[PDB]
Structures are given as structure tokens and as C-alpha cells.
Amino acid sequence: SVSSIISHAQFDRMLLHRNDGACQAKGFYTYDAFVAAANAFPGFGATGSTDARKRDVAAFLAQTSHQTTGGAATAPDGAFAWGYCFKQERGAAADYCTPSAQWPCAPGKRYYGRGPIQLSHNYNYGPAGRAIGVDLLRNPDLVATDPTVSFKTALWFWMTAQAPKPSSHAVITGKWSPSGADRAAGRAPGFGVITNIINGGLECGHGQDSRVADRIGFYKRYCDILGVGYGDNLDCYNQRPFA
Ligand SMILES: CC(=O)N[C@@H]1[C@@H](O)[C@H](O[C@@H]2O[C@H](CO)[C@@H](O[C@@H]3O[C@H](CO)[C@@H](O[C@@H]4O[C@H](CO)[C@@H](O)[C@H](O)[C@H]4NC(C)=O)[C@H](O)[C@H]3NC(C)=O)[C@H](O)[C@H]2NC(C)=O)[C@@H](CO)O[C@H]1O
Ligand SMILES: CC(=O)N[C@@H]1[C@@H](O)[C@H](O[C@@H]2O[C@H](CO)[C@@H](O[C@@H]3O[C@H](CO)[C@@H](O[C@@H]4O[C@H](CO)[C@@H](O)[C@H](O)[C@H]4NC(C)=O)[C@H](O)[C@H]3NC(C)=O)[C@H](O)[C@H]2NC(C)=O)[C@@H](CO)O[C@H]1O
């Protein structure tokens, strides 16, 4: 299903420079791990028309490519050939432990960005771990050391609604109906609101933002490679964050 939408050759063309010496994650991210992870989430790249499936895969890889980018405008083959360069948040400044009864933080552990989606916060490591059958509150480092677990956490985030946010998967496959609150916030279906779902607090609703732009650059390149249109509403420059 994922392999029916994106081949090993297409995966490598997209993630062209991930195994450069300039990349910390060199050798970590493999096509096999990506495919293995996708087996845990049967709807991913397998929901809707062939175009919707292509957008699902392209948007996933584009958003995650930005999360982990080592790109620069004048980098070899352009900024959008340098996704999946990192696997751990650079100079992570925080524990990212927001106390709650639901997701207790493990002593001495930190929930900074790890893996393709740069999964952060105890409140994401908790449910991600539960979904994949691995205790990620106690062993968050596993997101940075096991490639299959790494991709699975990213797909978990992609596929999972967290009210009032829909899943990014639902958005990109055209299965999301904005609420009245969404309409008032200027959140229309498209790649843009996915950026908002992932990191809208820091990136959205304040006009031009180079991180938002970077995500779109990867998306357009990956859509061109798979042979699919981008859809509408690619940015979140004028979207209020979800909270
Ligand atoms: C003046 C000049 O041209 N200098 C060159 C440098 O720009 C260049 O180094 C590269 O610089 C870009 C920014 O310009 C940098 O891009 C950033 O990459 C990080 C790491 O992936 C991203 O951080 C993620 O952000 C998201 C939020 O958006 C977090 O959720 C996530 O946790 C973060 N991930 C990690 C792993 O920490 C930044 O978002 C991204 N910035 C932007 C604006 O997109 C590249 O990583 C730099 N590349 C390298 C290899 O360090 C340098 C090399 O080309 O050359 C200088 O001359
Ligand atoms: C400093 C820095 O660079 N940090 C980056 C991280 O912030 C980023 O991880 C993403 O972080 C945002 C928060 O900024 C997070 O989004 C939050 O998600 C929670 C849980 O879904 C929401 O909390 C719920 O809100 C509703 C109301 O809206 C409540 O009813 C409900 O009870 C809340 N649940 C809990 C458990 O508190 C937040 O509202 C929401 N905030 C925003 C602004 O959207 C994302 O999930 C994080 N994304 C990921 C992939 O982890 C990370 C990745 O970009 O990079 C760090 O560098």
C-alpha cells in the first residue's frame, strides 16, 4: 500500500542527502523501516483515490522532512533534498514534561523532539507508546535509536486525532469537515492546517514564516515526484493556532 504509492527509488530521490556526512542520522532512516512502520497503520497511503494516497504519503514525508531537515537554500540539490538529516531535536532546551494524571513523566527523562515527526511532550510519548506497545514514557530514547519505532511514532501522530485537532491523515485525504471554530480561525482543509496541527503554536497565524515555507517546499517537490497536485491552502500564515 505504501510500497504501491512510493517505491524505494522514489523514497531515495526524495530523501537524497539523508546519508551525507553532514547528517547526524546518517544510516538510521531506511525504506524498510518506513514500510514496516506503515504496516501498523493500514489507512496510511491507502485511503481514498490514488491522488489522495499520493498526497497522504507526500505530505507525511514533507512535514517530517522539515522536522528533521539539514537543508539550506544553496545546499546541493536545493533545500528540499535534505530531509531526514536529524533524529533528535538540536540543542533541546527543555524536559517537555507537562504534569498530568494521564501521562506521568519518568524521573530523569526528557520528551524533546525525536524521530521523523520530532515527537515531543509526555502527552505525545505516552499515547504513542501505548499505541505501538512500547513504554515511551519510560524509554523515550527508543524513538531515536530504533528506526521502526521511530517511523511508527511519526505515523501515530499523523493518523491520530487529538480533539479539537483532526488527524493530519483525515485532512490530507479530504475527510475533514472544519467546525465553526475552525472557519472563524481561517483553518481550511489543506497542507497548511497540517503544519498547524504539528507545530501551529510556534509557526502559524503570524504571517510569513520560513519553517512553514520549508514544509511547503518539501511538499511541492515530493508531490512533483509522485505525480500529484498539491491541493489548496498550503500555508498557515493566516490561521489561528488550535490553542
Ligand atoms: C547564513 C547561512 O546561509 N548559513 C548556512 C546555514 O543556514 C546552514 O545550516 C542550515 O541552516 C538551516 C536554517 O537556515 C537549518 O534548518 C533548520 O533545521 C532544523 C533541524 O532540523 C529545524 O529544526 C526543527 O524545527 C522544528 C520546528 O519547525 C522542530 O519541531 C524540530 O524539533 C527541529 N528539528 C531538530 C532536529 O532540531 C529548523 O526548523 C530548520 N530551520 C528552518 C528555517 O527551516 C539546517 O538544519 C542547517 N543545516 C545543518 C546541516 O545544520 C549551513 C549548512 O548548510 O550553512 C551555513 O552557511
Ligand atoms: C520549543 C519548541 O521548539 N518546541 C517544539 C514542540 O512544541 C513541538 O511539539 C508540538 O508542540 C505542540 C505545542 O506547542 C503540540 O500541540 C499541542 O498538543 C496538545 C495535545 O494535543 C494540545 O493540548 C490539548 O489542548 C486541548 C484544547 O485545545 C485540551 O482540551 C486538551 O486537554 C489538551 N491536552 C493536553 C494533554 O494538554 C495543545 O493545545 C497543542 N498546542 C498547540 C499550539 O497546537 C504538538 O502536539 C507537538 N507536536 C509534536 C509532533 O509532538 C515539536 C514538533 O514540532 O518540536 C519542538 O521543537
Q: Residue share in helices?
A: 40-55%
What series of H and E elements makes up the topology?
A: HHHHHHHHHH
The first-level CATH class of the largest domain is given as Mainly Alpha
Largest sheet: none
Distance between the termini: 34 Å
According to CATH, what is the topology of the largest domain?
Answer: Lysozyme
Portion of residues in beta strands equals under 5%
- Please report the total strand number as a whole number: 0
Which hetero compounds are present in the coordinates?
A: a molecule of 4 linked components (NAG-NAG-NAG-NAG)
The general outline is globular
Structural domains: how many: 2
Mind telling me which CATH architecture of the largest domain this is? Orthogonal Bundle
Tally of separate helices: 10
Summarize the structure in words.
Belongs to the glycosyl hydrolase 19 family. Chitinase class II subfamily. The active site is at 67 (proton donor). With 243 residues, this protein is mainly α. It has helices spanning 8-14, 31-39, 50-67, 122-132, 142-145, 147-159, 168-172, 180-184, 191-203, 210-226. It has ten helices and no strands. The protein is globular. The structure holds a molecule of 4 linked components (NAG-NAG-NAG-NAG) (2 copies). A molecule of 4 linked components (NAG-NAG-NAG-NAG) binds at residues 22, 67-72, 75, 86, 89-90, 113, 118, 199, 210-211, 214.
